[PDB]
Amino acid sequence: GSSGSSGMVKLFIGNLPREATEQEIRSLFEQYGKVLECDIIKNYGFVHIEDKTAAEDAIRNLHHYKLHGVNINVEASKNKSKASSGPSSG
C-alpha cells in the first residue's frame, strides 16, 4: 500500500480442516482485499493481505466461518501498535 507505511499484514489461521486448500483460504481473503502469500502447515495457515485496514475486515467475518462443517479460528497475527512516548506531533 501507498497511503500506509507498514505494508502487507500477516494473518494467523488455526483449526483448519483437511479439505481446506491454499486457494479456498486465499480467496476468502480476496473478498476483503487482495492476497499476497498463503500457506497451510501444522493444522495452521498464514495469509498476507495488501493493506492493514483490509486485514481487520477479512478477519472479523472470516472469524468462525463455517467451512466444511468447521469453525476455523482467525487472529490478527501482527497486532497494532500505539505510540506512547511523545505526542507524535510530527
GROMACS .gro file of C-alpha atoms in nm:
model
   90
    1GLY     CA    1   0.000   0.000   0.000
    2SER     CA    2   0.096   0.364  -0.052
    3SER     CA    3  -0.109   0.563   0.200
    4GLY     CA    4   0.021   0.330   0.469
    5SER     CA    5   0.380   0.251   0.565
    6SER     CA    6   0.396  -0.091   0.731
    7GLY     CA    7   0.260  -0.267   0.424
    8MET     CA    8   0.123  -0.620   0.397
    9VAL     CA    9  -0.017  -0.779   0.713
   10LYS     CA   10   0.027  -1.144   0.811
   11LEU     CA   11  -0.273  -1.340   0.940
   12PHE     CA   12  -0.289  -1.646   1.166
   13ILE     CA   13  -0.547  -1.916   1.097
   14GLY     CA   14  -0.588  -2.222   1.316
   15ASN     CA   15  -0.831  -2.513   1.342
   16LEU     CA   16  -0.810  -2.579   0.968
   17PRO     CA   17  -0.978  -2.888   0.817
   18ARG     CA   18  -0.840  -3.137   0.564
   19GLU     CA   19  -1.042  -3.018   0.265
   20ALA     CA   20  -0.908  -2.666   0.314
   21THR     CA   21  -0.679  -2.559   0.029
   22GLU     CA   22  -0.428  -2.275  -0.002
   23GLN     CA   23  -0.675  -2.136  -0.255
   24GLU     CA   24  -1.003  -2.166  -0.065
   25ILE     CA   25  -0.832  -1.969   0.212
   26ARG     CA   26  -0.668  -1.711  -0.014
   27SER     CA   27  -0.993  -1.635  -0.197
   28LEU     CA   28  -1.184  -1.593   0.129
   29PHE     CA   29  -0.947  -1.302   0.190
   30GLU     CA   30  -0.954  -1.181  -0.170
   31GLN     CA   31  -1.309  -1.071  -0.087
   32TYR     CA   32  -1.185  -0.809   0.159
   33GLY     CA   33  -0.851  -0.741  -0.007
   34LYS     CA   34  -0.602  -0.895  -0.248
   35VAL     CA   35  -0.378  -1.167  -0.103
   36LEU     CA   36   0.000  -1.193  -0.138
   37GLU     CA   37   0.107  -1.518   0.029
   38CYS     CA   38  -0.086  -1.822   0.151
   39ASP     CA   39   0.044  -2.135   0.324
   40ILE     CA   40  -0.103  -2.423   0.524
   41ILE     CA   41   0.105  -2.623   0.772
   42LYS     CA   42   0.074  -2.774   1.119
   43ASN     CA   43  -0.305  -2.753   1.104
   44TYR     CA   44  -0.244  -2.380   1.060
   45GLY     CA   45  -0.247  -2.133   0.772
   46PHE     CA   46  -0.088  -1.794   0.710
   47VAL     CA   47  -0.250  -1.527   0.493
   48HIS     CA   48  -0.095  -1.194   0.394
   49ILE     CA   49  -0.328  -0.912   0.289
   50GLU     CA   50  -0.246  -0.595   0.096
   51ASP     CA   51  -0.334  -0.319   0.342
   52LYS     CA   52  -0.390  -0.338   0.718
   53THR     CA   53  -0.743  -0.198   0.732
   54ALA     CA   54  -0.828  -0.475   0.485
   55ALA     CA   55  -0.699  -0.742   0.723
   56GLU     CA   56  -0.941  -0.648   1.001
   57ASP     CA   57  -1.242  -0.659   0.769
   58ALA     CA   58  -1.146  -1.007   0.649
   59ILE     CA   59  -1.054  -1.147   0.991
   60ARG     CA   60  -1.373  -1.016   1.151
   61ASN     CA   61  -1.604  -1.200   0.911
   62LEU     CA   62  -1.376  -1.493   0.824
   63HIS     CA   63  -1.375  -1.544   1.201
   64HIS     CA   64  -1.582  -1.852   1.283
   65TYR     CA   65  -1.653  -1.901   0.912
   66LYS     CA   66  -1.837  -2.232   0.879
   67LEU     CA   67  -1.601  -2.407   0.638
   68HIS     CA   68  -1.668  -2.773   0.556
   69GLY     CA   69  -1.862  -2.805   0.880
   70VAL     CA   70  -1.585  -2.647   1.086
   71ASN     CA   71  -1.537  -2.324   1.280
   72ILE     CA   72  -1.195  -2.201   1.168
   73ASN     CA   73  -1.027  -1.953   1.403
   74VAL     CA   74  -0.881  -1.624   1.281
   75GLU     CA   75  -0.650  -1.385   1.465
   76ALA     CA   76  -0.456  -1.075   1.361
   77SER     CA   77  -0.102  -1.211   1.387
   78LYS     CA   78   0.056  -0.866   1.364
   79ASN     CA   79  -0.124  -0.665   1.632
   80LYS     CA   80  -0.148  -0.286   1.603
   81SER     CA   81   0.092  -0.054   1.786
   82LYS     CA   82   0.028   0.279   1.957
   83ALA     CA   83   0.300   0.537   2.024
   84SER     CA   84   0.305   0.619   2.395
   85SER     CA   85   0.616   0.834   2.435
   86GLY     CA   86   0.573   1.175   2.276
   87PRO     CA   87   0.253   1.326   2.133
   88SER     CA   88   0.369   1.219   1.787
   89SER     CA   89   0.309   1.575   1.668
   90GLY     CA   90   0.534   1.532   1.366
   0.00000   0.00000   0.00000
